[PDB]
Amino acid sequence: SRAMMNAFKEITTMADRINLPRNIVDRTNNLFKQVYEQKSLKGRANDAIASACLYIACRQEGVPRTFKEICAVSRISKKEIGRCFKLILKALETSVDLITTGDFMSRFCSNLCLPKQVQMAATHIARKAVELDLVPGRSPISVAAAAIYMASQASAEKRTQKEIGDIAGVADVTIRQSYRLIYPRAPDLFPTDFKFDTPVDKLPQL
């Protein structure tokens, strides 16, 4: 047992750089030990397997912007976390898709001190994203709550998957399946309003 003890130090060191509490460090640790012996993770990326697990326990509630942020905390082969991620996600998808309807108001989506600047900026992204059909996996209203958590990372306004997506009582497959594939290689969905409070000029991924 060696790499196993090395993946536990990368699971707690990653949450310490994401500004998250030990709560996310308790899920990323139990997430790696639960998928550390999978039939596709003999041990070729202890830091890449933990980073993904972090994007899970945090995407549920405790991560601003999106995975693009949970990645800035880890730098172990960014070409693997993407794969190993789909593996730790299949072992625990979610099964929350049971609303995707109580998000048309978009008024209670800013109960965490969020500025309307990102509220009108998010609608602009889902405006051309839903009108162009880039990821109609679930429904259109899903792009509404996914555009709110997507604008938080491009409107110089960071938030949390909880106060940004959980407050929408929509579904985890709406924000994660809305941007999971709503861009070819960047957020080029803005119509012209979203001036891009943040200087990303290329902020893909949610």
Structural method: NMR
185 and 109 assigned to the same domain: yes
User: Tokens standing for 204?
Assistant: 């893909």
User: Tokens standing for 43?
Assistant: 């041990």
46 and 74 assigned to the same domain: yes
Burial readout 75-105 (b: 16 or more C-beta within 10 A, e: otherwise): ebeeebbeebbeebbeeeeeebbeebeebee
Q: Which amino acid is at 57?
A: A
Q: Is residue 111 classed exposed, middle or buried when 0-12, 13-18 and 19+ CB atoms within 10 A define those classes?
A: exposed
Annotated binding residues, written as ranges, equal 42, 44, 79, 86, 138, 162, 171, 174, 176, 180
**Residue 130 is inside which H or E element, if any?**
helix 116-132
105 and 35 assigned to the same domain: no
CA–CA distance, 134 with 46 (Å, rounded to integer): 33
Give me the sign of the Cα torsion angle 138, 121, 18, 165. Answer: negative
76 and 41 assigned to the same domain: yes
- Alpha helix locations (H) across 3-59? 3-17, 22-34, 46-59
Among residues 154, 204, 148, 144, the alpha carbon closest in space to that of 180 is found at: 204
52 and 113 assigned to the same domain: no
Give me the sign of the Cα torsion angle 45, 67, 62, 142. Answer: negative
139 and 39 assigned to the same domain: no
For 150, which DSSP code?
H
Find where tokens 């593996």 sit. 87
175 vs 7, 41, 80, 143, CA distance in Å? 28, 27, 22, 7
Q: Are 25 and 57 in contact (CB under 8 A)?
A: no
Q: Are 143 and 130 in contact (CB under 8 A)?
A: yes
Q: Are 51 and 145 in contact (CB under 8 A)?
A: no
104 and 57 assigned to the same domain: no
* Total domains in the fold of the chain: 2
Which residues, including other chains, have CB under 8 Å from residue 72's CB and lie 6 or more apart?
17
For 39, which DSSP code?
T
102 and 203 assigned to the same domain: yes
Domain residues for the domain of 134 are 98-206
User: Tokens standing for 45?
Assistant: 């990326």
CA–CA distance, 130 with 120 (Å, rounded to integer): 15
103 and 175 assigned to the same domain: yes
Which residues, including other chains, have CB under 8 Å from residue 13's CB and lie 6 or more apart?
none
Annotated binding residues for DNA, written as ranges, equal 42, 44, 79, 86, 138, 162, 171, 174, 176, 180
90 and 29 assigned to the same domain: yes
153 and 109 assigned to the same domain: yes
For 64, which DSSP code?
S
The angle at the Cα of 94, spanning 13 to 97, to the nearest 5 degrees, equals: 135
For 137, which DSSP code?
S
